[PDB]
Design a protein around this ligand. Structure first.
Ligand code: EBE
Ligand code: NA
Ligand code: ZN
Ligand code: ZN
Length: 345
């Protein structure tokens, strides 16, 4: 298989759909991945990528993160939740991510983008929430640990909501660095978790980084604020950690056009191209992006285009607001205790 960008998609993930078939009444809908896929087709980006076949995760693979009971309950269906197809679709999302992750980790592909639903980052050990059932990215990381002896994994979560599930999965593990940029507003946004002072536990202390933006939408966060977060917090810590593989929980709901509580921020789709490019400089370019949140179809299609374009190696000022500066300072202050690059902050 050609050493280029990988894509994974599967039409059976469209069948995690309520029988009413409405986008309106359920914002995590089939049209999210359908629209991204055709956008990558239309722009000729699919033709420059290796499109790999996906599969269902085994119950055993799901049990690297979730309890047996949870994997039986949402991973099998004897006689939104589609009573026929959701169990299969949720398993497909995990297995598609896993397949792409391994091809990149082994050197078979350069990098990749997983066009998957339902999303994963809110799913805890025994609890689904936020339209997530199994944590696809966490399962893929665990499998890298158990089947490829990957010593250091960076998980970057740039979905605008905190990935409570992923934080839980690796909270005591120093070999996985979980790094979330999210709207936090002192605990008063969705889900409500992800404080800057949650740094990990036991051997994992210092290896959970919550880049929690606080101060609400006054003014709302934008390109300059995320670029500054990347320059002052994300990349210094990510570089010092020196990961062997990068996984990105890539929600696009920070993009302009997501009203609160689905978003509230003013990132441009282009900015995600620039963030992707910055993460590609780590881990010998071994990076996989998996779709998490993001609702508005033009926003997520634009941001996907810019990420996949950046992954292929193509190409395409302002001070950060006082709320953002205060937020970054709170994080740097906490993490000065654990990271040499922030010792003097
Ligand atoms: C009161 C209240 N406020 C917010 C939510 C909520 C927001 C986002 C997601 C989710 C997400 O983005 N998680 O990061 C999502 C949405 C749409 C499409 C896809 C999604 F993943 C799930 C739940 C629930 N309840
Ligand atoms: Na960790
Ligand atoms: Zn319905
Ligand atoms: Zn989200």
């Amino acid at each position: 298989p050609r050493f280029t960008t990988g894509l994974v998609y599967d039409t059976l993930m469209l069948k995690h759909q309520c029988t009413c078939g409405s986008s309106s009444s359920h914002p995590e809908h089939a049209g999210r991945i359908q629209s991204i896929w055709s956008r990558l087709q239309e722009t000729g980006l699919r033709g420059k990528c290796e499109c790999i076949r996906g599969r269902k995760a085994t119950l055993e693979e799901l049990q690297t993160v979730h309890s047996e009971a949870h994997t039986l309950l949402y991973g099998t269906n004897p006689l939104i939740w589609n009573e026929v197809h959701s169990a299969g679709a949720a398993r497909l999302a995990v297995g598609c991510v896993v397949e792409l992750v391994f091809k990149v980790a082994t050197g078979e592909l350069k990098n990749g983008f997983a066009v998957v639903r339902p999303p994963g980052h809110h799913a805890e050990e025994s609890t689904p929430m936020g339209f997530c059932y199994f944590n696809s990215v966490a399962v893929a990381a665990k499998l890298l640990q158990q089947r490829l002896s990957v010593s250091k994994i960076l998980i970057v979560d740039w979905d605008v909501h905190h990935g409570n599930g992923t934080q839980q999965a690796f909270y005591s593990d120093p070999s996985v660095l979980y790094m979330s940029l999210h709207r936090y507003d002192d605990g008063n946004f969705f889900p409500g978790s992800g404080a800057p002072d949650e740094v990990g536990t036991g051997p994992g202390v210092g290896f959970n980084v919550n880049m929690a933006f606080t101060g609400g939408l006054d003014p709302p966060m934008g390109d300059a604020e995320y670029l500054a977060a990347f320059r002052t917090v994300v990349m210094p810590i990510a570089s010092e950690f020196a990961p062997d593989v990068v996984l990105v929980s890539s929600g696009f709901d920070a993009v302009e056009g997501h009203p609160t509580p689905l978003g509230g921020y003013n990132l441009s789709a282009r900015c995600f191209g620039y963030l992707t490019k910055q993460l590609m400089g780590l881990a010998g370019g071994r990076i996989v992006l998996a779709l998490e949140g993001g609702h508005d179809l033009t926003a997520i299609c634009d941001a996907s285009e810019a990420c996949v374009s950046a992954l292929l190696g193509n190409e395409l000022q302002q001070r950060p607001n006082a709320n953002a500066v205060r937020s970054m300072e709170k994080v740097m202050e906490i993490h000065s205790k654990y990271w040499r690059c922030l010792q003097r902050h």
